[PDB]
Structure 1
Amino acid sequence: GSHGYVTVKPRVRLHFVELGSGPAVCLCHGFPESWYSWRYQIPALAQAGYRVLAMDMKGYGESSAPPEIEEYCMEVLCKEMVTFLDKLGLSQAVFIGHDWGGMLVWYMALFYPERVRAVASLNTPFIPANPNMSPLESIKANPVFDYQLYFQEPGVAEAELEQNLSRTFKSLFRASDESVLSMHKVCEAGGLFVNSPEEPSLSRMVTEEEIQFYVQQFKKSGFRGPLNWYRNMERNWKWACKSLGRKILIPALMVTAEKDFVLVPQMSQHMEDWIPHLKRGHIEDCGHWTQMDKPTEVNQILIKWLDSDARN
């Protein structure tokens, strides 16, 4: 891979790993991850005939990580990704996201369809903003997203996640059957790791060397930037409401994971109302950490879609 750096603002520089030739495919990771979360996809997509740009998203890795909350609202993040394309001299790119990156790519497709050739999300569904319900009332109706309330107070989740980096990543990056964390009980317990092992075992999904890569990446900036993605609920809601009723008409793929107990497949059930020609993939025995849980399946699904529906 090549390490690429794009200055989108005087103080904001975005880093990416680049491999391959062909149509541009921009990969956008989730929380709390890395370009490295795409390690299995990058060579496979390149081999398939694509130019891969695997991002360190704003706040992560070698990308800029300002402390200000407003720097991580979806409107700003998407605008920067447009400038990213501008600086690279790209008219369009395919955008593939997972988790928080999945949310970003949906809004890229929604607000900047002229710059998005095609869009794919792993796990993260597209649910249009509800102008009659505040972001807090949407959690008040969904006990599943309550852990995000714990992420609200600045400094709190930062301290817990940064206390022991190895423990953090070993505790998070696990297959569903290996889970040591209860996401539906976080805010009541006052932490992610209060009731989980002090020295967690290594998941079948990852090697020690892979965990240590994440550790080193988060030694650089910590979790403030990453957590700030959660702290713009009102701003993101207000921006999203400006696009009420509009449909996504560019080629689109939604990939669900059977064993993601937070981003459940059922959450995606109404997407066709807003994305008429949506295509779908579904991975059995797959938890939240899709790319590393089922890399072979992810590669198969993405390549099939890129070579067919995504082309015009």
Structure 2
Amino acid sequence: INLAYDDNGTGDPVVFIAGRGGAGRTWHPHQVPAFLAAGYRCITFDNRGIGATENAEGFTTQTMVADTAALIETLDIAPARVVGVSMGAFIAQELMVVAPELVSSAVLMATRGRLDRARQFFNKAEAELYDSGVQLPPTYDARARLLENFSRKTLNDDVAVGDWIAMFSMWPIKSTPGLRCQLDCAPQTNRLPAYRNIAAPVLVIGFADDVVTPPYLGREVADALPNGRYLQIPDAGHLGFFERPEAVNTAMLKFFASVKA
């Protein structure tokens, strides 16, 4: 099954893999233009479970890893640079485990390598929400998204907040069978030992105020990877790449410029 993708520019290819609920579109407001300006070719796409595949259920991390590998193969861009956030970083991580040959280097944002407690609490709360059929009223849904994705410093800034709240109406997230199944595409065991075998250079970025995937969990992924290093962005919540795009793009671009394709 083909997944929608958007292909931009020419040059060294970078494939972006969004987190749970994110269409490939998530990368265009803040990442793609900056990468096109530094000379890369950018590929974004709709993970299984999103848009045209939003009714897909019963798929797994392995399915999604295969979807990603197939995309890289179908476009004849092996090995590609990869940028992943959360579920997307986990997909990248697992891709490097089974097909290290498709990936030259990667940036992994807001990631983790095991089924830690925070993740367990998140799994349960989200699954429960789905299984109850309860609809959160809109302002209450928007307030939770604010509290979970943004830093302290952002909530203090009355202009920004009015944009984030405007931004939420432009970015609806529909409760679908696909979104539910994406919830399972996360570590269920300790994957750190399997990451010890990944040769590729890797930047892990932790966001300082991230409550969904706390920063220290990315440091555990970076420590495991022989060629991994850890970097922390201050004043960024879980949507750090949207909230501090300059700091995060500068970090990724410096790292990708230091490394061979």
Give the TM-score category using the shorter length.
0.7 to 0.9
2:15: which partner in 1? 26
1:14: which partner in 2? 3
Deviations 1:90-117 (A, max 9, x none): 2221111111111111111111100111
Q: What is the CA-CA distance between 1:276 and the residue it aligns to?
A: 1.5
Residue 91 in 1 paired to residue 78 in 2?
yes
Specify the SS of the correspondent of 1:268.
helix
Q: What is the CA-CA distance between 1:148 and the residue it aligns to?
A: 1.1
Amino acid at match of 1:206: W
In structure 2, which of residues 220, 223, 235 is the aligned counterpart of residue 285 of structure 1?
Answer: 235
Deviations 1:199-238 (A, max 9, x none): xx97256362x333322xx46xx432022122367xx647
1:155 and 1:144 mapped to 2: Cα distance? 16
Residue identity (%):
19
Counterpart contact for 1:125–1:254, Cα < 8 Å: no
Specify the SS of the correspondent of 1:269.
helix
Alignment of 1:28-67 (within 5 A): 28-38=17-27, 39-61=29-51, 63-67=52-56
Counterpart contact for 2:97–2:198, Cα < 8 Å: yes
Alignment root-mean-square deviation, CA: 3.0
Amino acid at match of 1:108: L
In structure 2, which of residues 239, 242, 245 is the aligned counterpart of residue 295 of structure 1?
Answer: 245
Specify whether residues 224 and 152 from structure 1 end up closer, same or farther in structure 2 by C-alpha distance, changes over 3 A only. same
2:120: which partner in 1? 145
1:232 and 1:254 mapped to 2: Cα distance? 19
Specify the SS of the correspondent of 1:270.
helix
Counterpart contact for 2:118–2:212, Cα < 8 Å: no
2:145 and 2:111 mapped to 1: Cα distance? 18
Question: Whose helix fraction is larger, Structure 1's or Structure 2's?
Answer: 2
Report the TM-score when normalising by structure 2: 0.83
Specify whether residues 301 and 158 from structure 1 end up closer, same or farther in structure 2 by C-alpha distance, changes over 3 A only. farther
1:158 and 1:90 mapped to 2: Cα distance? 42
1:226: which partner in 2? 179
Q: What is the CA-CA distance between 1:266 and the residue it aligns to?
A: 1.6
Counterpart contact for 2:153–2:235, Cα < 8 Å: no
In structure 2, which of residues 152, 158, 163 is the aligned counterpart of residue 177 of structure 1?
Answer: 152
* Bigger Rg over Cα: 1
Counterpart contact for 1:257–1:284, Cα < 8 Å: yes
Amino acid at match of 2:44: A
Moved more, 83-92 or 93-102: 83-92
Counterpart contact for 1:95–1:116, Cα < 8 Å: yes
Alignment of 1:120-135 (within 5 A): 120-127=107-114
Specify whether residues 154 and 259 from structure 1 end up closer, same or farther in structure 2 by C-alpha distance, changes over 3 A only. closer
* Structure 1 gap segments, 5+ residues each: 1-8, 128-137, 181-200
Specify whether residues 203 and 226 from structure 1 end up closer, same or farther in structure 2 by C-alpha distance, changes over 3 A only. same
Specify whether residues 46 and 175 from structure 1 end up closer, same or farther in structure 2 by C-alpha distance, changes over 3 A only. same
Counterpart contact for 1:29–1:35, Cα < 8 Å: yes
Residue 213 in 1 paired to residue 203 in 2?
no
In structure 1, which of residues 271, 277, 285 is the aligned counterpart of residue 221 of structure 2?
Answer: 271
2:258 and 2:185 mapped to 1: Cα distance? 36
Specify the SS of the correspondent of 2:161.
coil
Specify whether residues 254 and 158 from structure 1 end up closer, same or farther in structure 2 by C-alpha distance, changes over 3 A only. farther
Report the TM-score when normalising by structure 1: 0.71
Specify the SS of the correspondent of 1:43.
helix
Q: What is the CA-CA distance between 1:118 and the residue it aligns to?
A: 1.1
Alignment of 1:111-122 (within 5 A): 111-122=98-109
